[PDB]
From a paper:
Cu-Zn [name] ([name]), which catalyzes the conversion of two O2− anions into H2O2 and O2, operates mainly in the cytoplasm and plays a central role as a cytoprotectant against oxidative stress. Human [name] ([name]) is a highly conserved 32 kDa homodimeric metalloenzyme, with each monomer containing a zinc cation (Zn2+) for structural stability and a copper cation (Cu2+) for catalytic activity. The imidazole ring of His63 acts as a ligand to both cations, bridging them together. The well-established ping-pong reaction mechanism of [name] involves the sequential reduction and reoxidation of copper by two distinct O2− anions.
Using X-ray synchrotron cryocrystallography, we determined the crystal structure of recombinant wild-type [name] (please see the Materials and Methods section, Section 4.1, for the sequence information) at a 2.3 Å resolution in the monoclinic [name] space group, with unit cell parameters a = 178.19 Å, b = 138.25 Å, c = 112.93 Å, α = 90°, β = 129.2°, and γ = 90°. The asymmetric unit of the crystal consists of six [name] homodimers (A-B, C-D, E-F, G-H, I-J, and K-L chains), comprising twelve independently refined monomers. In addition to 1 Zn2+ and 1 Cu2+ cation per monomer in the metal-binding sites and a total of 503 water molecules, the final model also includes 4 sulfate and 4 acetate anions originating from the crystallization mother liquor. The Zn2+ cation supplemented prior to the crystallization formed a center of symmetry (ZnCRYST) and glued four different chains in a near-tetragonal geometry with angles of 95.03°, 90.99°, 84.18°, and 97.95°. The ZnCRYST anchors these residual His-1 residues in chains B and D, as well as the otherwise flexible His110 residues in chains A and C. Notable structural differences were observed in loop II (residues 23–27) and the Greek key loop, loop VI (residues 102–115), particularly around residues Asn26 and His110. Initially, the copper active site predominantly adopts a distorted tetrahedral geometry, where His46 coordinates through its ND1 atom, while His48, His63, and His120 coordinate through their NE2 atoms. The stepwise coordination of water molecules within the copper active site orchestrates a dynamic sequence of conformational changes in the catalytic region, guided primarily by the positioning of the bridging His63 and the copper-coordinating His120. Water molecules play a crucial role in reshaping the active site geometry, transitioning it from a distorted tetrahedral to a trigonal bipyramidal configuration. The orchestrated dynamics of water molecules influence both allosteric regulation and catalytic activity by interacting with Arg143, leading to conformational changes in the active site.
Residue numbers in the entry:
A (entry chain B): -2 to 153
B (entry chain A): 1 to 153
Amino acid sequence: SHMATKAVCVLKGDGPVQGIINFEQKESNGPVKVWGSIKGLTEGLHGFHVHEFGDNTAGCTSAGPHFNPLSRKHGGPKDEERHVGDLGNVTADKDGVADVSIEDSVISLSGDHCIIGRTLVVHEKADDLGKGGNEESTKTGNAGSRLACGVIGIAQ
Amino acid sequence: ATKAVCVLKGDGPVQGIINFEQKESNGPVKVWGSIKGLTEGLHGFHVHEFGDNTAGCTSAGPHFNPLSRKHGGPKDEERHVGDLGNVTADKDGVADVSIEDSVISLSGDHCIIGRTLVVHEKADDLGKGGNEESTKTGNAGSRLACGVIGIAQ
Ligand SMILES: [Cu+2]
Ligand SMILES: [Cu+2]
Ligand SMILES: [Zn+2]
Ligand SMILES: [Zn+2]
Ligand SMILES: [Zn+2]
């Protein structure tokens, strides 16, 4: 019992980047709907992953690597070979506002792929989805630094 | 040996780091850390229902209360699962936190991972206040700092 069906995350950092991202999974093994808004972003694509640790002690850098329980290489959300936390990119319009609505079946709000208590992150550059051609791309997608993060938590 | 952490922030000077350790399932949890910016005295201290900060510490909801009981002190039988009692801040305004509770847990059905830790303005009267507020919040007043309890290395 008490397996979460709804979660929320408030993204914040040392810059103007901040938003609210909601999660929702009405079925235990079903997909998770991620939707919300993030502002303060440069127009274009930005990486969007669930990192391993809900540790904000040192900002977003304490959150650790991409949540990778299956010890896979980095990739796009649609790729088979991916990190559990690899949700791809979010797109910011010309006014810095990135409406977010993605749906993912790898992450879960309950079970072994459970993301509750971990850190959602949005990055400076685009997630090259592991196609970058260097070992860094296999690790992070060359998404750059962490502009904002927050701990994923149970929502009423 | 589960481990978690919580960075407490607010609209004021209160801020701290609070570590959790549950070395065994359904066993006791050690809560230790430091909170600066407090006013000399005791401050209410509990886990709330929701790890929801979309409206500051307000949106964290009431004390984690899966059993639907009345508020109490952590040694009481009639208590909210989240009811961790008080912490004490010196004349310095620094509170050194060290607690051990066997009701909260870092796993299980009623795990506090993903919920919110809140440090309150006033002392928690442990439900002995003689008013309906005492049996809900212990009259610990407004919420000064809070963070989502998250999974730590
Ligand atoms: Cu990331
Ligand atoms: Cu409280
Ligand atoms: Zn990845
Ligand atoms: Zn229950
Ligand atoms: Zn209580």
